[PDB]
Amino acid sequence: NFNGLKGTGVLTESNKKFLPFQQFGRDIADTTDAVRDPQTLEILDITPCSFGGVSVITPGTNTSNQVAVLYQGVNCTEVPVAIHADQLTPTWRVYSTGSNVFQTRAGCLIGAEYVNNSYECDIPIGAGICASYQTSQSIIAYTMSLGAENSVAYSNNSIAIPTNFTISVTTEILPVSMTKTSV
Amino acid sequence: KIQDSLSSTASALGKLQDVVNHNAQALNTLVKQLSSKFGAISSVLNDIFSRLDKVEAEVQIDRLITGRLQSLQTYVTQQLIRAAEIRASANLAATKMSECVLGQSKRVDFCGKGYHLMSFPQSAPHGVVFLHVTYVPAQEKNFTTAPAICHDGKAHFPREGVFVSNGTHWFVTQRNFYEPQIITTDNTFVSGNCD
Amino acid sequence: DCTMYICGDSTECSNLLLQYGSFCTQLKRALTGIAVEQDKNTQEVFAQVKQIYKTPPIKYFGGFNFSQILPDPSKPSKRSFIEDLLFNKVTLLICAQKFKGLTVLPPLLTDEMIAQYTSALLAGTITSGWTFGAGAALQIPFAMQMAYRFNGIGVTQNVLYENQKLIANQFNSAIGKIQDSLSSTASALGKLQDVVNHNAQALNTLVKQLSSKFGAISSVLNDIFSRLDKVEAEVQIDRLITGRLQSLQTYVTQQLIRAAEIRASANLAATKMSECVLGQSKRVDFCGKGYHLMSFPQSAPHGVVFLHVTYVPAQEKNFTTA
Amino acid sequence: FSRLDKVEAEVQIDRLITGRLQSLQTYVTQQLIRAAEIRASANLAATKM
Numbered sequence: 010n011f012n013g014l015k016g017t018g019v020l021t022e023s024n025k026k027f028l029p030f031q032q033f034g035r036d037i038a039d040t041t042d043a044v045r046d047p048q049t050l051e052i053l054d055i056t057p058c059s060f061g062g063v064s065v066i067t068p069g070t071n072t073s074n075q076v077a078v079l080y081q082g083v084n085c086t087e088v089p090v091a092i093h094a095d096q097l098t099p100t101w102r103v104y105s106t107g108s109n110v111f112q113t114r115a116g117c118l119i120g121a122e123y124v125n126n127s128y129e130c131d132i133p134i135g136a137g138i139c140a141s142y143q144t145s146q147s148i149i150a151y152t153m154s155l156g157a158e159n160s161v162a163y164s165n166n167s168i169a170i171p172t173n174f175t176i177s178v179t180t181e182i183l184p185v186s187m188t189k190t191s192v
Numbered sequence: 193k194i195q196d197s198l199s200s201t202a203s204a205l206g207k208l209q210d211v212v213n214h215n216a217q218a219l220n221t222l223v224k225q226l227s228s229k230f231g232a233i234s235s236v237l238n239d240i241f242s243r244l245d246k247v248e249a250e251v252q253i254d255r256l257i258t259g260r261l262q263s264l265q266t267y268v269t270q271q272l273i274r275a276a277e278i279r280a281s282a283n284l285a286a287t288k289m290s291e292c293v294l295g296q297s298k299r300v301d302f303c304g305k306g307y308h309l310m311s312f313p314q315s316a317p318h319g320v321v322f323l324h325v326t327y328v329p330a331q332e333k334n335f336t337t338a339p340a341i342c343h344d345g346k347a348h349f350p351r352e353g354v355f356v357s358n359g360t361h362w363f364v365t366q367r368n369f370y371e372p373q374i375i376t377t378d379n380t381f382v383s384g385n386c387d
Numbered sequence: 388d389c390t391m392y393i394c395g396d397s398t399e400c401s402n403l404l405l406q407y408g409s410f411c412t413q414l415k416r417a418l419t420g421i422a423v424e425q426d427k428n429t430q431e432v433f434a435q436v437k438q439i440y441k442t443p444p445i446k447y448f449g450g451f452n453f454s455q456i457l458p459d460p461s462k463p464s465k466r467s468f469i470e471d472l473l474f475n476k477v478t479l480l481i482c483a484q485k486f487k488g489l490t491v492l493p494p495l496l497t498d499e500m501i502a503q504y505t506s507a508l509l510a511g512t513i514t515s516g517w518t519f520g521a522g523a524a525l526q527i528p529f530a531m532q533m534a535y536r537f538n539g540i541g542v543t544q545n546v547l548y549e550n551q552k553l554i555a556n557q558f559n560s561a562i563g564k565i566q567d568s569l570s571s572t573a574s575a576l577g578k579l580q581d582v583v584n585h586n587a588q589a590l591n592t593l594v595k596q597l598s599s600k601f602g603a604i605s606s607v608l609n610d611i612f613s614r615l616d617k618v619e620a621e622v623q624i625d626r627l628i629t630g631r632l633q634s635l636q637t638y639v640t641q642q643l644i645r646a647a648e649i650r651a652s653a654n655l656a657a658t659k660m661s662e663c664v665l666g667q668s669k670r671v672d673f674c675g676k677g678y679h680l681m682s683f684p685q686s687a688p689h690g691v692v693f694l695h696v697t698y699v700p701a702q703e704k705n706f707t708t709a
Numbered sequence: 710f711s712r713l714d715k716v717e718a719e720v721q722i723d724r725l726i727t728g729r730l731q732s733l734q735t736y737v738t739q740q741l742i743r744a745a746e747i748r749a750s751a752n753l754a755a756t757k758m
């Protein structure tokens with residue numbers, strides 16, 4: 010509550026150079042995000058808490074109950090600081106330092122360990138990360154791979170004529186109509 | 193082998209089950225969505241009339257008869273969208289039933305993931321399945337090429353076929369089977385010089 | 388999010404939104420359905436192969452100059468030069484002011500793999516030719532291949548024999564001159580940034596839409612609570628929250644239309660990489676404005692650029708027939 | 710206005726402005742759906758051409 014400008018959020022230190030008479034600082038959404046303390050000319054910046062949601066990466070509940078959460082684009086050296094509920098919540102706030110925390114371009118995946126060799130992938134994680142439930146079973150995150158780089162002996166005299174074949178029969182499935190409804 | 197792949201998993205028929213799933217789950221939300229009060233005093237409607245005077249009972253029922261009136265138009269709007277790609281897949285289906293089955297398609301990878309042979313429709317719930325009989329090449333062998341020749345001091349090039357040799361003679365083969373043949377005047381024509 | 392856009396940094400609003408319930412839950416499902424298809428497109432446009440090829444260190448392509456399109460190892464990335472200008476021309480404080488939950492999720496694929504997929508195709512279409520979209524690719528040298536693509540027009544192979552030297556060098560000049568035409572102006576790339584301009588100004592309209600009073604006394608939730616009775620406060624705040632939620636449905640119902648037309652360009656570009664670069668296409672004025680030879684794909688920010696190498700006849704003469 | 714005073718006619722007239730505004734948003738939406746169908750048929754003619 011600064012001069013009747015109510016709200017909610019944490020306060021930080023700002024380097025903005027307010028004019029002698031200006032006091033509030035707005036943004037595109039016409040939301041106050043920079044106020045000057047009435048007590049002294051110090052400039053404060055108002056920021057929200059840690060946000061962005063959490064995208065848990067779990068196999069089916071038919072299989073084990075192991076998880077590996079994801080934080081959307083947060084440098085999570087600050088998630089332990091933002092967490093004061095470790096005693097209150099079991100197996101949730103403890104994830105601030107769980108398995109070997111890994112850092113991607115889309116925030117830090119927590120609860121899994123990077124592996125070197127590249128396979129096909131199952132669960133799209135983001136920014137170049139997939140996972141699967143393997144090894145003693147745990148969560149392993151890696152980088153995708155269409156396959157081993159097949160080197161072709163390109164040459165100005167080389168060609169390849171197949172000498173056999175196969176007649177595959179694949180099934181393409183197409184919808185043609187939905188259910189007729191009436192209200 | 194087809195029947196094993198059909199029973200291999202539950203995702204083989206995932207592109208029809210989605211339609212019945214996405215057009216029966218829509219109903220369930222539409223039924224559930226009338227439990228919301230929309231800021232009124234109660235979800236049920238007879239109690240509103242039996243608890244407040246007609247002078248200001250119309251204020252609240254107005255907020256409720258507009259919430260449902262817009263909770264219902266949203267279902268229609270999402271239904272116009274969902275009927276635009278089915279109309280855009282009954283046109284591709286009425287096309288693979290129009291060229292794969294009514295003849296052979298010269299398109300590459302349209303009626304078959306590779307060179308194409310035939311097609312078959314099998315009627316399915318709210319859809320169709322095409323047993324796209326397809327050709328796919330198998331193992332190969334190595335050869336060296338020379339797209340020219342000159343024998344009688346002048347060019348003489350074949351009617352149709354490449355000049356590939358294994359080490360003994362240059363042979364003629366088509367583009368997806370090793371099928372050689374010796375040089376003969378029947379498949380050979382003179383065309384310009386050989387320099 | 389359901390609440391980060393309406394009931395952010397407040398608690399008296401989060402309780403009120405819960406009774407509504409199934410509305411914004413449908414919102415999250417709509418924008419999650421769009422997101423998945425945004426990967427079913429790029430996985431289909433480029434990744435129609437099962438082997439990431441790569442050209443050998445030898446770079447003598449049939450006598451035709453190809454350095455422009457094939458990536459140069461000396462560059463930090465295996466990215467072709469044209470993609471440098473292509474990524475340069477396209478333009479993108481744009482996210483730090485989106486504290487309202489509009490968190491642009493990054494694509495699953497990254498720009499290098501998309502380049503890695505893209506370079507596979509030119510690795511494919513040049514080394515393997517028109518038969519690498521049908522399973523096992525077959526190496527094809529680039530010089531004598533023309534005797535077959537030309538053969539699919541009506542001209543005998545003798546065009547590339549009796550006129551090899553003049554035909555061979557002519558294909559060289561046109562390829563190089565295109566780089567200059569790419570550097571001409573911004574009108575050529577008008578069909579890419581229009582997408583990023585359309586899909587970024589919409590976000591800005593959504594964010595500034597929060598400032599609307601929507602008939603309420605105050606545009607901020609905290610102020611309306613502190614100057615009027617609690618029993619009558621229910622209808623006042625409920626007026627505003629419906630306005631925002633109605634305004635949120637307008638934004639999503641525009642993306643459903645937008646996602647339904649990029650799906651067309653995601654299903655026609657999946658053909659020119661399946662019927663056109665993988666075989667001399669025959670849909671007239673579809674690949675080549677004229678009799679067709681082949682194509683050469685490239686990449687771009689949220690789109691694809693093609694270089695359709697067409698064939699247009701030159702000057703003519705008249706005669707007498709029977 | 711000529712019958713009911715300004716003090717409360719705002720909410721009374723607000724019930725009528727929202728009635729028309731909801732109708733425009735319906736009319737324009739049906740155009741966006743329709744305009745795609747013509748665009749679909751504007752390319753099944755540009756091909757037969």
Ligand SMILES: *[C@@H]1O[C@H](CO)[C@@H](O[C@@H]2O[C@H](CO)[C@@H](O[C@@H]3O[C@H](CO)[C@@H](O)[C@H](O)[C@@H]3O)[C@H](O)[C@H]2NC(C)=O)[C@H](O)[C@H]1NC(C)=O
Nearest residue numbers: 333334335356357358359360361362363371372373374375
């Ligand atoms: C390359 O493929 C040919 C195809 O069979 C292999 O056979 C060699 O070439 C011709 C085959 O048309 C033979 O010439 C004729 O053979 C018959 C039957 O032996 C003979 O009666 C005739 O008088 C005439 O010689 C040739 O003999 C045959 N063998 C050799 C050693 O040249 C050929 O072996 C293959 N070359 C390779 C794999 O290096």
Ligand SMILES: *[C@@H]1O[C@H](CO)[C@@H](O[C@@H]2O[C@H](CO)[C@@H](O)[C@H](O)[C@H]2NC(C)=O)[C@H](O)[C@H]1NC(C)=O
Nearest residue numbers: 171172173174175176329330331332369370371
């Ligand atoms: C293509 O490969 C198949 C698979 O082996 C070949 O089928 C074999 O044919 C021979 C004689 O024709 C039989 O003795 C084998 O038992 C067959 N294999 C199987 C698995 O049944 C076929 O012959 C090959 N075709 C060509 C032209 O080489």
Ligand SMILES: *[C@@H]1O[C@H](CO)[C@@H](O[C@@H]2O[C@H](CO)[C@@H](O)[C@H](O)[C@H]2NC(C)=O)[C@H](O)[C@H]1NC(C)=O
Nearest residue numbers: 162164166167168333334335336337357358359
């Ligand atoms: C046979 O196939 C091979 C496939 O790699 C072709 O390439 C030769 O491979 C061998 C190794 O098995 C090397 O020793 C040769 O040096 C490769 N050739 C060249 C030109 O480098 C080979 O050319 C094919 N041979 C024929 C006669 O078709």
Ligand SMILES: *[C@@H]1O[C@H](CO)[C@@H](O[C@@H]2O[C@H](CO)[C@@H](O)[C@H](O)[C@H]2NC(C)=O)[C@H](O)[C@H]1NC(C)=O
Nearest residue numbers: 446447448449450451452453454455459559563
């Ligand atoms: C096709 O033309 C290009 C034009 O740049 C050639 O690239 C040049 O190659 C020479 C050596 O052949 C280098 O000295 C130049 O520096 C290259 N140019 C640039 C701008 O770097 C290319 O080599 C030609 N194709 C072939 C097969 O020689």
Ligand SMILES: *[C@@H]1O[C@H](CO)[C@@H](O)[C@H](O)[C@H]1NC(C)=O
Nearest residue numbers: 068069070071072073201202
């Ligand atoms: C549950 O997982 C097990 C693997 O331990 C698998 O065999 C089983 O089929 C799964 N359940 C269902 C219903 O598929």
Ligand SMILES: *[C@@H]1O[C@H](CO)[C@@H](O)[C@H](O)[C@H]1NC(C)=O
Nearest residue numbers: 082083084085086087112114
């Ligand atoms: C993330 O935090 C680490 C440790 O404080 C720091 O070294 C790194 O530069 C940070 N990365 C950012 C802010 O992008």
Ligand SMILES: *[C@@H]1O[C@H](CO)[C@@H](O)[C@H](O)[C@H]1NC(C)=O
Nearest residue numbers: 122123124125126127151152
């Ligand atoms: C994994 O790869 C890194 C470099 O990519 C290497 O330093 C490390 O030794 C590798 N570890 C194993 C177990 O292969």
Ligand SMILES: *[C@@H]1O[C@H](CO)[C@@H](O)[C@H](O)[C@H]1NC(C)=O
Nearest residue numbers: 164165166337338445447530
């Ligand atoms: C292929 O290229 C190499 C080097 O460029 C050359 O020595 C050889 O003669 C070429 N072969 C043909 C058939 O052009």
